Structures are given as structure tokens and as C-alpha cells.
Curated annotation (Swiss-Prot):
The lineage of its organism: Eukaryota, Metazoa, Chordata, Craniata, Vertebrata. This is Urokinase-type plasminogen activator long chain A. It comes from the Eukaryota. The chain holds residues 69 to 153 of 431 of the full protein. Disulfide bonds join C2-C83, C23-C65, C54-C78. Residues 2-83 form the Kringle domain.
């Protein structure tokens, strides 16, 4: 057990996810467009903060993020304390 739950404000300052793909701004003209951004007051209260990092916009077993790859934001969880046993 490493990530006890998903972790809201539990240090999610990584613009780099598991597949080594760079995580970005939540409030980005791209994610803000998507389904999980700074826009919905709760997202932030659930784990976001208009950062540019893997956090909890849902309740993933470990902080995740979308990663714009050639105009293609794709979610890949972050290589944090997720306990990939």
C-alpha cells in the first residue's frame, strides 16, 4: 500500500506520467475543454488546482493526468506512490 486512496492535495506536482508522457495544465485550453479541469469547482475540491500536473480529477488509485501528444490529450496515471506491485 503506497497511495492510500487517490490523494487530493497529496503532492501531485509531476508533469510526467507512467509511460514517461508529460502531464499538463488542468485549466489548459485543452483539458479545460475536456471533462476534468479547474472549471468545475469540485474538481479542484477533489484534487485539482489549475496546476499542470497529475492529480485526482476522478479518484484514480493514484494521481493521473492527460498528456497532450500531437494534439491528443491522453490519460496515463503518474509514476508516483501508486504501489505497482
Amino acid at each position: 500500500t503506497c497511495y492510500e486512496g487517490n490523494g487530493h492535495f497529496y503532492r501531485g506536482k509531476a508533469s510526467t506520467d507512467t509511460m514517461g508522457r508529460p502531464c499538463l495544465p488542468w485549466n489548459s485550453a485543452t483539458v479545460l475543454q475536456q471533462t476534468y479541469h479547474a472549471h468545475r469547482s469540485d474538481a479542484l475540491q477533489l484534487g485539482l488546482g489549475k496546476h499542470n500536473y497529475c492529480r485526482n480529477p476522478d479518484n484514480r488509485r493514484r494521481p493521473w493526468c492527460y498528456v497532450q501528444v500531437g494534439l491528443k490529450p491522453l490519460v496515463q496515471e503518474c509514476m508516483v506512490h501508486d504501489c505497482a506491485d
